Design a protein around this ligand. Structure first.
Ligand SMILES: OC1(c2ccc(Cl)cc2)CCN(CCCC2(c3ccc(F)cc3)SCCS2)CC1
Ligand SMILES: OC1(c2ccc(Cl)cc2)CCN(CCCC2(c3ccc(F)cc3)SCCS2)CC1
Ligand SMILES: [Cl-]
Ligand SMILES: [Cl-]
Lengths: 99, 99
């Protein structure tokens, strides 16, 4: 698709057979999702954003379907204000910025 | 141009006669720039990101040139390590997400 940006680029993703709304965010390096329980061993990780550092659990090789497109990659879970799909998965679905 | 997301989408912008680099950020509603002195009146705002809130100063009708494209709009100035171009200016230069 072509998504214009007069509205937030909020998309339905499915992960763990859960449907969630997430923002397509070219300014985020990583995908970070609101607290949820995923099967698997996780690494604790601290990540920094503008208001400060948050503590997240790192899950690798998680399958995620984003607007009908499959991706397999790291998901960081923790206290983000919104579900954010960052560049590690936007690259996998072939996403580019155009102007 | 078409920008892939293998790396951070940093582009060159010009404000005043200052040459700066900035992150193209589809998840940001607002443009937030590093601490600088701009013309006109401003009002404080609190904006929250990952990690919490920062206080910024709001300037309206600032001309910003981003990859040779002219935009004019509100800019929030605050303590950020990166200049972030949000959706309010991204629509002005006709930028879209595509996959
Ligand atoms: O869109 C945001 C946002 C959107 C919506 C909501 Cl509700 C909250 C935040 C999330 C990302 N930040 C920009 C962070 C830029 C830096 C960075 C990039 C990626 C990363 F994972 C960590 C840091 S680049 C160098 C230091 S910060 C703006 C607001
Ligand atoms: O533009 C922001 C910004 C710009 C630049 C920088 Cl550096 C930081 C932030 C500051 C304002 N928020 C407003 C929306 C916040 C909430 C929300 C998020 C996403 C969504 F899809 C719907 C609602 S999150 C929970 C309730 S509204 C977005 C990022
Ligand atoms: Cl942030
Ligand atoms: Cl926010």
């Amino acid at each position: 698709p072509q998504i214009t940006l007069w509205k937030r680029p909020l998309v339905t993703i499915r992960i763990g057979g859960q449907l969630k709304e997430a923002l397509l965010d070219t300014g985020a390096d990583d995908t970070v999702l609101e607290e949820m329980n995923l099967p698997g061993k996780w690494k604790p990780k601290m990540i920094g954003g503008i208001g400060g550092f948050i503590k997240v659990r790192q899950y690798d090789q998680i399958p995620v379907e984003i607007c009908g497109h499959k991706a397999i990659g790291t998901v960081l879970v923790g206290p983000t204000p919104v579900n954010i799909i960052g560049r590690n998965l936007l690259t996998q679905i072939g996403c580019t910025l155009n102007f």
